[PDB]
């Protein structure tokens, strides 16, 4: 669960690049 | 009244998985319904799931395929899904989304109600007081159900729960015959059978059995095959609940609703959760299963100033004999009481395979008694349970000890046990059984024993049938 | 045995309570003394406010501290009703010093409507362009922080050092 | 009864002692409080301009 | 205020165009006024949590600003009403709409403001006098059993400038105009108090008075102190009404508050029927427990936060009434459901499953919840005193004391009351295990017993050690064959049978056993243990040399006394004078030593 | 000793549960046998 | 000395959980302290945790509530947290944050010390070997605690660990026999106030409240200040030890609540988890809490720690007991089974262990036969337990004489040695004599843990 949460947050912050 | 013409767009940034993301939407609204059109003139539908200013998102029910960047059009309806609820569906069959499948027309409904439904006043609720006739002796005799009582049916994959459910459909009735046959002419009883995710074979089995019984004057059959859209799976129970509420309250009926395979319903919930981009919870199921299942279960009971009730009986497919699985645990938490089936009894070719040893009805003590039925029904069920327990225990001692050390009373217990599974548990497919003759059968079984060891019942009530 | 232990416990408890109360009164006296000293200092500061000449240098120091601290293009200064002729003079004196020190220009204004409370003994307030950054360079606050930071030497002169203090660190 | 009497006696004794120490502390104050507040004024008079140590243009 | 409403990852929705606001601040959304509050904030826009189906909510819709966090409103008329988790008057809602469904977003104050009440000022406060928080300034005759004192809220003080005379004032009326330093304020008889904190109290005093219970068992064996904390198990059919009804009717407590989440309407209709039936005749007349109790319940349809916050709300109401100078009892039903609600909330907020899916801070929250109890005394002029007791029900999964929540509840609580289904089907009422149930409040009440009765503790210790001796010798007497054992073992077994069939039973429906007072309990205990004492004393005397007494001789000689011991419960203390009952004990004892002397 | 060697997995959970249940079944059978035998022992002793 | 006027910014760019972000902050000072002015005027406090660019994340000691992004203000200190220390604080009471509780004044603070403290030079350490007189036979003789050591006690809910703490702080002494006394230090950790009242009352029972530096914290108080309180208490201990030449009996309680608060903070900060979900740096944090102890060259003072902790589910492999065992030398492990057997003091002797026997005992301090007596007693008790387990099934008939002797020895050991009572201080010599009397039941041959010389010298009595 923690690993999935971490990658989801990574994808999210990548999404807000612009 | 909606006097606002519909809007059709053509711009779309793209899609994403089974969802559809577009832009420049004028004043989007959540859970808004929408129709779609492909380049080849193919029509679909959808529901709105996410909104961010001008960027709307919508899941296509039929399933995304062949969608083009420019040559596609959506058309908003500007309203949540609107159920065409009414009284005349009885004797009709519908698919997942309510489209007729029995070669009938679009329903000419007199009412338009919200699909999601609303909760009831907790103040406005009554204590259940009567029972419902089921026709299975193991059910009525041991764990009789009441009006508003919610009882599930636990069953393993690959058991004949579906046939038992169909029998309960074609057999369920009231008990007004006890007071007078003339009083039974008030046939306010009804049935609402919804099957989801079921193979076409058993769907055909259901519809054929119903058509054979010739009792669809008081039935509302919703059906949803497995291959149908995943989204529509979470839609059918809400439609069934809305229709059941309409019949029970606005039409003052006593509706027995039954639901099947809520494990697959949980899988559909998982589908939408994956579509929502929300991290899964325990055992992968979403952490808000509780609220949704609670809203589904609690739509029943009796109300003040009304003549009607709703009784729910779901069927849960216990995954691989896992009592600790979250779904059955929470379903036991919400509902009241439970009924078990057995694989070993199914292997013994005794139908229906119902295990009464762990079975328990929560509020049976007030669902049964004098006036409602014969006075000593609960007494009889308690006697049968205790005698069955003693018979099982002495058989277990027997299997290792031996008949050399066995006394006559134990032989009588063994005979009672054998006759009990041979006769009382055994029902058969088309044996319309009533409460009175089942009570007679139980009395005949109890009469194998004299009064000496029939201790738990006062003699004042044993004189009623023991000396016959 | 049990009654005697009970009554013994009662009386020794009430004795310890008396001792604690007496020591608390001692501490009350110490607190009164130090608070009176702080009040003495405050009234001396208000007394010496009156000297215009040194007050001018103090306002110069305060405004140049504000300039050296705010580091923005938009400067705002607030002061009392009866001192702004000195404050603006200090501002003109302090502008070129800041410009040479930071190699950058700065625009400054003075609030002609909002003025500090009359109960303020001294000092000014520094605001940025949007009133989202503030420096509380008033006499009360600097007195307070200096007193808090200097308490050790204060009592070291008054009450003296501790006998049990063996090593400075 | 004897216990409360002795408690009153001891309370009077310790009260006398506390008053004696109060007199001692006020004497210690008035010894040098004037020089101390003079040191405080000497401290607060300073300004010492200084830009932030690691600011760069 | 034009909420730039986004979609949802569930019910949760965010929006923009929000001015200065603080987290956990109530907000209405849309023209349907769906309830929520702030969860997170950032820049100018904030995320929020709604508690209803968000369907029909469009973009840009208005959001109503408030000025308080989650809070409860309290005042005259709260007693006797029915509410839910977010303090909504469902009775008044059925009165206003006459429908069978919840109207979404009810804008109805819990207290009907069109009702008049008879107010009398203090008569002691004068114009220009200074008063602070917690100080009574008047009263209102809310009901004939309980006088609803009205006092200033905390964090408020000033010099009064006007006193409203006695008369007939509605809920919206003003009675006090207090000039604080440089400012003025308005004061009505309703007050608003946030929920996630405790109103300050002047001091906490130790518990020094037993909690009266109608059942003699659980009182003379495993007592609970007034203002304490207790844990009762909860199982389908084991029997929970047996304690709730007895506590509501027969109890020294002044007010009752019952809370819960995920329950039925059956208990509600039961207490409706118990309004006339379980009436207490303090004045010889039928007054409804409704006047002495307030109900609040929630179904599983209610939002998760409503279930979460109803438990806090119970403590808030109990605090409001303990401030008045009264004694409160709390029925915190279905705590495991509260734990599940908190787990659901954490799952909504995407926290880590610290233990068994439950969040990290469950135990800390439970400890904070159980911190609010005990005997205290609050700010005010007359220096009243009150107390608050808690009774939290716990539903282990099948009796396993291993899931974290039950372990925490066992750890924090002091006295545990055991229940059993074996005893339940054994037609034994009330069921108590006697071996897992324990207490820890004996030390506090020692002085009370020493002052009032002076024989309670030794007799109680003799009772419990006799029961333990029976439990020990049960295995040995099973192993031997139940035909060979010393005479002292026989008398211990026999007195265990008698204390079983006689002292540890009670029938509520039986008119004379409806209430067993404490003095009756200790009288039975002393009589029985003294009989056993003389019995085994004489047995030890005669066993060695000659005239070896056996139980058969004792029984045939003292059969009349055994019958009297079995039948002495039939007393009816309501009619029979208490002094006569004590005289009956005296003459029964007289017969005891006469028979024991004549045996030798 | 303190445990039996096994790699954690759902498989071992199921197998250990089954073995456990069989163990209590045996315990019940042996208990009943011993009880009957003690009854007979007492009878023959008296006789 | 800091002649820099203070600053204050209103640019609150967000709030998420117990964290707050401040934009446009000028030149952040890491590990700072700030004060917060709520709109209604209530004061709050926190420490800056993270800084990056013109942003500064800051955690709030008392917890986020009511903070408004447009109305509240925040002001900056520029210095790490420094706590007031004072030798006159003894006999006072304060909350977790340090403010007075007894209507006492703001403490006159002899100095301002770093809350985080500083490490100690390795070479500037001296080993402690002085045995402490506890008065408990199970400690003096078996798990004797020496000065400059940090043995905790592993206890569960409902156990009488509080009374053990009372006894050890009451009957403290010196085995090696001017006057002596121990400056008690104690800080609560959110424990229910009943235990706090009991400790207070027992501390007046000692009759030396003038040497009782006390701190408090209750469950209803904010959780996150529990991260600060023990560090403040340890700073006080440092000040009273290495500046005033005093011995301090530092004692804590309920480290499980500390672990829980640190866990909640870590979860809010979404760090990498570990076993059972605990933070990775919980070990280093516990190290900073515990290793601040001992005594150093040039000072006669010393630091002794007794950080009793809660032990959930009575599981030895639970992470908190495990890591506390690693970081420390010794343990006690009060037993639930013994307390259910109605015996006091209920300390299991077997799982307990003390690592300071290497120098605390021996000839010239207590005797030339302490260590071998203890080793023999441990071996006999362990084998007694094993034969008891064997007897639990095999039955007395098939046993041998040795088995019955071992069972009788175990019975004597439990009824006499462990049974000590609540207020009966006992000397080292009496415990040694009692142990010898217990051992006398076994003839000399089977004593496989005693040298020949000592066995011939002492046994025949």
Distance CA G162, CA G167 (A): 9
Could you tell me the strand order of the sheet in which G212-215 lies? G93-94, G212-215, G183-187, G247-252, G302-307
Q: What is the Cα–Cα distance from B307 to B250, expressed in whole angstroms? A: 10
CA distance B351 to B143: 17
CA–CA distance from B2 to each of B5, B77, B115, B388 (Å)? 8, 10, 18, 64
How many CB atoms within 10 Å of residue C18?
15
Contact C59, C83 (CB under 8 A): yes
How far apart are the C-alpha atoms of G64 and G62, rounded to whole Å? 7
Question: Structure resolution in Å?
Answer: 4.3
Is domain B1-468 in CATH 3.40.50.720, yes or no?
A: no
Q: Which 383-422 residues of chain B touch chain F by CB within 8 A?
A: 396-397, 400-401, 405
Query: How far is residue E380's CA from residue E323's CA, in Å, rounded to a whole number?
Result: 9
* Structural tokens at position E399: 């009796």
Alpha helices in B223-320 (DSSP H): 230-233, 236-245, 262-276, 289-297
User: Per-residue DSSP letters for B188-223?
Assistant: -EEEEEEEEEE-HHHHHHHHHHHHHHT-GGGEEEEE
Rounded CA gap, G20 and G59, in Å?
Answer: 6
Neighbours of chain G (3+ CB pairs under 8 A): A, C, D, E
Tell me the C-alpha distance between G97 and G62, whole Å: 9
- The answer, yes or no, to whether the previous bond of C61 is cis (omega within 30 of 0) is no
- Residues of A with CB below 8 A from B280's CB? 1, 4
Q: Please indicate if any CB of chain C lies within 8 Å of the CB of D57.
A: yes
Tell me the domain boundaries of chain B: 1-468
Please indicate if any CB of chain E lies within 8 Å of the CB of B294: yes
Structure token digits, residue C135: 């420096």
* Residue in E246, E237, E253, E153 with CA at minimum distance from that of residue E425: E237
Contact C159, G86 (CB under 8 A): no
Query: What is the side-by-side order of every strand in the sheet holding E176-180?
Result: E130-131, E158-163, E176-180, E183-187
Binary contact (G223, E361; C-beta < 8 A): yes
Q: Which residues, at least 6 apart from E550, have a Cβ–Cβ distance to it below 8 Å? A: E487
Q: How many CB atoms neighbour CB E14 within 10 A?
A: 21
Cβ distance C12 to G2 less than 8 Å, yes or no, reads no
Q: Which residues are CB-neighbours of G445 under 8 A, at least 6 positions away?
A: none
Is the Cβ–Cβ distance between E258 and E272 less than 8 Å? no
DSSP assignments along E111-160, one per residue = S-TT-EEEEEE-SS--TT-EE-TT-EEEEE--SSS--EEEEPPSS--EEE
The arrangement of strands across the sheet holding E136-140 comes to: E148-151, E136-140, E116-121, E167-170
CB atoms < 10 A from the CB of B224, how many?
A: 23
CATH 3.40.228.10 fits G1-461, yes or no: no
Of E561, E553, E78, the C-alpha closest to E291 is: E78
Structure tokens at E436: 């897992």
The rounded distance, in Å, linking the Cα atoms of B456 and C11 is 66
First to last CA, chain E: 96
State the smallest CA–CA distance between residue E313 and chain A in angstroms.
34
Residue E204 CA to residue E212 CA, distance in Å, equals 21
Short-list B392, B297, C169, CA closest to G298: C169
Helices (H) and strands (E) in chain B, counts: 14, 17
**Spatial separation of the C-alpha atoms in residues E86 and E52, rounded to whole Å:** 13
Q: How far is it, in rounded angstroms, from Cα E199 to Cα E195? A: 9
The CB-side HSE value for E377 (13 A sphere, CA atoms) comes to 10
Please report the sign of the dihedral spanned by the C-alpha atoms of residue B401, residue B405, residue B410, residue B416.
positive
Provide the 10 A C-beta neighbour count for residue E446. 11
Residue E350 in contact with partner chain A when CB distance is under 8 A: yes
Residues of chain G contacting C141 with CB distance shorter than 8 Å:
5-6
CB G293 within 8 A of CB G148: yes
Q: How far apart are CA C163 and CA C167, in angstroms?
A: 11
Rg (Cα) of chain A, in Å, rounded? 8
Residue B51 phi, psi (nearest 5): -145, 135
Q: Do residues G346 and G425 make contact, with C-beta atoms less than 8 angstroms apart?
A: no
Task: Name the structure determination technique.
Answer: cryo-EM
Give the nearest partner residue to D25 out of C18, C30, C142, using CB atoms: C30
Of C16, C24, C169, the CB nearest to G104: C24
Candidates E254, E245, E146, E258; CA nearest to E209 is E254
Tokens coding E193: 């108090």
Instruction: Count other Cβ atoms within 10 Å, centred on residue C40.
Output: 15
Burial of G298 per CB tally in 10 Å (0-12, 13-18, 19+): exposed
Counting one residue from chain C and one from chain D, the pairs whose CB atoms sit within 8 A come to 81
Say yes or no: B279 contacts chain A, CB-CB below 8 A: yes
The answer, for G273 touching chain E at a CB cutoff of 8 Å, is: yes
Rounded distance between C-alpha atoms, residue B62 and residue E62, angstroms: 35
Contacts of E447-455 with CB under 8 Å at 24 or more apart are E447/E208, E448/E208, E448/E209, E448/E210, E453/E522, E455/E522, E455/E526
Contacts of G332 (CB under 8 A, 6+ apart): G139, G143, G151, G152, G153, G154, G164, G347, G352
Assign residue B278 a region: left if phi > 0, alpha if psi is -120 to 50, beta otherwise? beta
Instruction: State which residue of chain F sits closest to B322, comparing Cα positions.
Output: F14
H-helix or E-strand containing D6? helix D2-45
The length of chain A, given as a count of residues: 18
Return the structure tokens found at B439. Answer: 């009570």
Residue B284 C-alpha, separation from nearest chain A C-alpha, in angstroms: 9
Residue C56 token pair? 């001018």
B62 three-state secondary structure: coil
Give the closest residue to B280 by CA, choosing from B266, B293, B296, B259: B266
Q: Does residue G67 sit in helix, strand or coil?
A: coil
Angle B311-B312-B314 from CA coordinates, rounded to 5°: 160
Helix (H) or strand (E) holding C134: strand C133-135
DSSP state of E172: T
In the beta sheet, which residues pair with residue C138?
Answer: C123
Nearest residue of D to residue C140 by CA position? D44
Orientation angle between helical segments E404-412 and E362-371, nearest 10 degrees: 30
How many residues would you count in chain E?
A: 600
Are residues B192 and B244 in contact, defined by beta-carbon separation less than 8 angstroms? yes
Greatest CA separation for chain A: 28
Q: Which residues of D touch C143 (CB under 8 A)?
A: 44
**Cα(first)–Cα(last) distance of chain G, in Å?**
74
Q: What is the CB neighbour count within 10 angstroms for residue G145?
A: 23
What are the C-alpha distances in Å from G327 to residues B304, G156, G275, G282, G283?
Answer: 67, 20, 17, 11, 8
D-chain CB neighbours of G27 within 8 Å are 52
For residues B228 and B45, give the distance between their C-alpha atoms in angstroms, rounded to a whole number. 13
Structure tokens at G163: 């009374």
**Cis peptide leading into B14, omega within 30 of 0?**
no
CA distance E390 to E315: 9
Touching check for F28 and chain B: CB below 8 Å? yes
CA distances from E467 to E87, E419, E496, E499, F22 (A): 48, 17, 7, 9, 36
Give yes or no for F29 touching B (CB within 8 A). Answer: yes
Q: Residue E355 and residue G277: Cα distance in Å, rounded?
A: 8
Compute the distance between CA of residue E277 and CA of residue E275 in angstroms, rounded to an integer.
6
Task: Check CB contact of E347 with chain A, cutoff 8 Å.
Answer: no
Tokens describing residue C14 = 């009430």
User: Which B residues, 59 through 98, put their C-beta within 8 Å of a C-beta on chain E?
Assistant: 80
CA pair distance E366, E354, nearest whole angstrom: 16
Tell me how far apart the alpha carbons of residues E441 and E226 are, in angstroms, rounded to a whole number: 10
β partners of residue B153: B315, B339
Find all residues with CB under 8 Å of E378, minimum gap 6, and list them. Answer: E134, E201, E202, E322, E323, E325, E384, E386
Q: Is the peptide bond before G437 cis (omega within 30 degrees of 0)?
A: no
Burial of residue E579 (CB within 10 Å: 0-12, 13-18, 19+) is: exposed
Q: With the CA atoms of B314, B319, B320 and B321 taken in that order, what torsion angle do they form, in degrees rounded to the nearest 10?
A: -50
Exposed/middle/buried for E194, CB within 10 Å: 0-12, 13-18, 19+?
middle
Q: Which residues pair with G33 in a beta bridge?
A: G47
- Under an 8 Å CB criterion, which residues of G touch D? 3-4, 27
C-alpha distances in angstroms, B149 versus B152, B337, B448, E1, E416? Answer: 10, 9, 34, 46, 32
Instruction: Give the contacts of B268 (CB within 8 A, at least 6 positions apart).
Output: B197, B230, B231, B233, B234
G263 touches chain E (CB under 8 A): yes
Give helix B326-334 / helix B262-276 axis angle, nearest 10°: 110
Q: How far apart, in whole angstroms, are the C-alpha atoms of residue G377 and residue E89?
A: 71
What is d(CA F23, CA F12) in angstroms, rounded to the nearest whole number?
16
Interface test with B, best of E95, E240, E266, E301 (most B CBs within 10 A): E301
Candidate from E20, E198, E360 with C-beta closest to G260: E360
Quote the radius of gyration of chain F (alpha carbons, Å). Answer: 18
Q: What is the DSSP string of E220-232?
A: SSS--BTT-EEEE
Neighbours of D, requiring at least 3 CB pairs below 8 Å, are C, G
Chain-centroid distance of CA C158 in Å reads 20
What 3-state class would DSSP assign to E271? Answer: helix
Chain A residues in contact with B277 by the CB 8 A cut-off are: 8
CA D31 to CA D28: how far, in whole Å? Answer: 5
Q: List residues bridging with G249 in a β-sheet.
A: G184, G304
Instruction: Tell me which chain G residue has its CA closest to the CA of residue D46.
Output: G3
Question: G113-128 burial string, b = 16+ CB within 10 Å, else e?
Answer: bebeeeeeeeeeeeeb
Distance from CA of E574 to the nearest CA of G (A): 40
Q: How big is the CA angle at G302 (ends G296 and G304), to the nearest 5 degrees?
A: 125
Residue recorded with tokens 């004299």? B450
Given a contact cutoff of 8 angstroms between Cβ atoms, the answer to whether E217 and E504 are in contact is yes
Asked if residues G232 and G113 have their Cβ atoms less than 8 Å apart, the reply is no
Is E201:E373 a contact under the CB 8 Å cutoff?
A: no
Residues in chain B closer than 8 A to F28 (CB atoms): 396
Q: How far is A14 from chain G (nearest CA, A)?
A: 18
Asked if residues E39 and E23 have their Cβ atoms less than 8 Å apart, the reply is yes
Distance CA G461, CA G458 (A): 7
- For tokens 């009373």, the residue is B409
Would the annotation count B283 as a binding residue? no
Where does residue B451 fall: left (phi above 0), alpha (psi -120 to 50 degrees), or beta otherwise?
alpha
- The token pair that represents D2 in the structure block: 């004897």
* Under 8 Å between Cβ of E341 and E308: yes
Chains that touch A (3 or more CB pairs under 8 A): B, E, G
Distance CA D30, CA D34 (A): 8
């Amino acid at each position: 669960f923690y690993r999935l949460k971490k990658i989801q947050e990574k994808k999210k912050i990548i999404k807000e690049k612009f | 009244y909606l006097s606002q013409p519909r809007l059709t767009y053509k711009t779309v940034s793209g899609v994403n998985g089974p969802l559809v993301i577009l832009d420049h939407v004028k004043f989007p609204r959540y859970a808004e319904i929408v129709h779609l059109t492909l380049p080849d003139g193919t029509k679909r539908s959808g529901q709105v799931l996410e909104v961010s200013g001008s960027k709307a998102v919508v899941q296509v029910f039929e399933g995304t395929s062949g969608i083009d960047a420019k040559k596609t059009s959506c058309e908003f309806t500007g309203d949540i899904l609107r159920t065409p609820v009414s009284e005349d569906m009885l004797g009709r069959v519908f698919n997942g989304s309510g489209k007729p499948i029995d070669r009938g027309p679009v329903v000419l409904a007199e009412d338009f109600l919200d699909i999601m439904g609303q909760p009831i006043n907790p103040q406005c609720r009554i204590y259940p007081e009567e029972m419902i006739q089921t026709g299975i002796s193991a059910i009525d005799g041991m764990n009789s159900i009441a009006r508003g009582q919610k009882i599930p049916i636990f069953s393993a994959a690959g058991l004949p729960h579906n046939e038992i459910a169909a029998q309960i459909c074609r057999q369920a009735g009231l008990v007004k015959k006890s007071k007078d046959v003339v009083d039974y002419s008030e046939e306010n009883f009804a049935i609402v059978f919804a099957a989801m995710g079921v193979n076409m074979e058993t769907a055909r089995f259901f519809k054929s059995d119903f058509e054979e019984n010739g009792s669809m004057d008081n039935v509302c059959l919703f059906l949803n095959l497995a291959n149908d859209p995943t989204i529509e799976r979470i839609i059918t129970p809400r439609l069934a609940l809305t229709t059941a509420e309409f019949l029970a309250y606005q039409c003052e009926k006593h509706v027995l609703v039954i639901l099947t395979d809520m494990s697959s319903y949980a899988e559909a919930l998982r589908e939408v959760s994956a579509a929502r981009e929300e991290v899964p919870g325990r055992r992968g199921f979403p952490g808000y299963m509780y609220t949704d299942l609670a809203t589904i279960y609690e739509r029943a009971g009796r109300v003040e100033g009304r003549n009607g009730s709703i009784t729910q009986i779901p069927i849960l497919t216990m995954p691989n004999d896992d009592i600790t699985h979250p779904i059955p645990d929470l379903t036991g938490y919400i509902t009241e009481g439970q009924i078990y089936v057995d694989r070993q009894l199914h292997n013994r070719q005794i139908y229906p395979p119902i295990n009464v040893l762990p079975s328990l009805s929560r509020l049976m003590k007030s669902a049964i008694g004098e006036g409602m039925t014969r006075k000593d029904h609960a007494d009889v069920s308690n006697q049968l349970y205790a005698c069955y327990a003693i018979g099982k225990d002495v058989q277990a001692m027997k299997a290792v000890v031996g008949e050399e050390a066995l006394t006559s009373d134990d032989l009588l217990y063994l005979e009672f046990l054998q006759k009990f599974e041979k006769n009382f548990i055994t029902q058969g497919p088309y044996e319309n059984r009533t409460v009175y003759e089942t009570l007679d059968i139980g009395w005949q079984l109890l009469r194998i024993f004299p009064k000496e060891m029939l201790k738990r019942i006062p003699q004042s009530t044993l004189s009623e049938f023991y000396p016959r | 045995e049990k009654k005697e232990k009970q009554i013994e416990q009662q009386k020794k408890i009430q004795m310890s309570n008396l001792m604690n109360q007496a020591r608390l009164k001692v501490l009350r006296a110490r607190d009164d003394l130090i608070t009176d000293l702080l009040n003495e200092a405050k009234q001396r500061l208000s007394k010496v406010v009156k000297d215009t000449t040194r007050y001018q240098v103090l306002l110069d120091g305060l405004v140049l501290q504000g300039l050296y601290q705010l580091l923005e293009p938009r400067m705002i200064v607030r002061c009392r009703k009866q001192d702004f002729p000195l404050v603006k003079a200090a501002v003109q004196k302090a502008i070129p010093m800041y410009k040479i020190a930071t190699k950058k220009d700065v625009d400054v204004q003075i609030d002609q409507e909002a003025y500090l409370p009359e109960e303020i003994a001294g000092g000014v307030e520094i605001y940025n362009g949007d009133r989202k950054i503030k420096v509380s360079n008033t006499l009360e606050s600097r007195l307070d922080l200096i007193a808090q930071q200097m308490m050790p030497e204060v009592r070291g002169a008054l009450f003296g050092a501790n006998a049990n203090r063996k090593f400075l660190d | 009864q004897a216990a409360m009497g002795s408690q009153g006696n001891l309370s009077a004794e310790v009260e006398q002692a506390t008053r004696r120490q109060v007199q001692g502390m006020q004497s210690s104050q008035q010894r040098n409080r004037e020089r101390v507040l003079a040191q405080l004024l000497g401290m607060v008079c300073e300004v010492r301009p200084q830009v932030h140590p690691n600011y760069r243009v | 205020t034009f909420g730039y409403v986004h979609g949802v990852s569930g019910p949760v929705v965010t929006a923009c165009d929000m001015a200065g606001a603080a987290m956990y601040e109530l907000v209405r959304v849309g023209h349907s006024e769906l309830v929520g509050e702030i969860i997170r904030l950032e820049g100018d826009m904030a995320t929020i949590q709604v508690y209803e189906e968000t369907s029909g909510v469009s973009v840009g819709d208005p959001v109503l600003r408030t000025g308080k966090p989650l809070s409860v409103e309290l005042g005259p008329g709260i007693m006797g009403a029915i509410f839910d988790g977010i303090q909504r008057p469902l009775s008044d809602i059925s009165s206003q709409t006459q429908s069978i469904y919840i109207p979404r977003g009810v804008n109805v104050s819990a207290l009907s403001r069109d009702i008049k009440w008879e107010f009398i000022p203090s008569k002691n406060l004068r114009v220009g006098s200074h008063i602070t928080g917690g100080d009574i300034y008047g009263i209102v005759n809310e009901n004939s059993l309980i006088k609803h004192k009205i006092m200033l809220p905390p964090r408020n003080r000033g010099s009064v400038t006007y006193i409203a005379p006695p008369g007939n004032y509605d809920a919206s009326d003003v009675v006090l105009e207090l000039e604080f330093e440089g400012v003025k304020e308005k004061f009505s008889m309703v007050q608003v108090w946030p929920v996630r904190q405790v109103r300050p109290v002047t001091e906490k005093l130790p518990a020094n008075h037993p909690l009266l219970t109608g059942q003699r068992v659980l009182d003379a064996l495993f007592p609970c102190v007034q203002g304490g904390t207790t844990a009762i198990p909860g199982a389908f059919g084991c029997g929970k009404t047996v304690i709730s009804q007895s506590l509501s009717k027969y109890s020294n407590s002044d007010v009752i508050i019952y809370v819960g989440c995920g329950e039925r309407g059956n208990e509600m209709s039961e207490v409706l029927r118990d309004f006339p039936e379980l009436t207490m005749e303090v004045d010889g007349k039928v007054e409804s427990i409704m006047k002495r109790t307030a109900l609040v319940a929630n179904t599983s349809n209610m939002p998760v936060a409503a279930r979460e916050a109803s438990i806090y709300t119970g403590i808030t109401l109990s605090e409001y009434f303990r401030d008045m100078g009264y004694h409160v009892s709390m029925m915190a039903d279905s705590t495991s459901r509260w734990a599940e609600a908190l787990r659901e909330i954490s799952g909504r907020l995407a926290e880590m499953p610290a233990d068994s899916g439950y969040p990290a801070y469950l135990g800390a929250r439970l400890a904070s919840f159980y911190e609010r109890a005990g005997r205290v005394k609050c700010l005010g002029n007359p220096e009243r005193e009150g107390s608050v007791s808690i009774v939290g029900a716990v539903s282990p999964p099948g009796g396993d004391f291993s899931d974290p929540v039950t372990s925490a509840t066992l750890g924090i609580v002091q006295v545990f009351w055991g229940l059993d289904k074996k005893l339940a089907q054994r037609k034994h009422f009330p069921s108590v295990n006697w071996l897992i149930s324990y207490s820890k409040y004996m030390r506090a009440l020692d002085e009370y017993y020493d002052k009032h009765f002076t024989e309670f503790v030794p007799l109680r210790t003799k009772a419990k050690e006799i029961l333990q001796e029976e439990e020990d010798l049960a295995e040995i007497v099973q192993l031997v064959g139940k035909a060979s054992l010393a005479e002292t073992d026989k008398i211990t077994l026999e007195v265990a049978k008698l204390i079983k069939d006689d002292f540890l039973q009670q029938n509520g429906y039986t008119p004379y056993d409806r209430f067993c007072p404490f003095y009756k309990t200790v009288g039975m205990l002393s009589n029985m243990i003294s009989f056993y004492d003389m019995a085994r004393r004489a047995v030890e005397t005669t066993a060695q040399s000659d005239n070896k007494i056996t139980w058969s001789i004792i029984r045939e000689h003292m059969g009349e006394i055994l019958y009297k011991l079995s039948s002495m419960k039939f007393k009816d203390p309501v009619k029979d004078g208490e002094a006569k009952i004590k005289a009956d004990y005296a003459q029964l004892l007289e017969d005891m030593q006469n028979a024991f002397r004549s045996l030798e | 000793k303190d445990r039996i060697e096994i790699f954690p997995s759902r498989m071992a959970q199921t197998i250990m549960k089954a073995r456990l249940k069989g163990a209590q079944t045996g315990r019940n059978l042996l208990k009943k046998k011993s009880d009957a035998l003690t009854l007979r022992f007492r009878q023959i002793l008296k006789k």
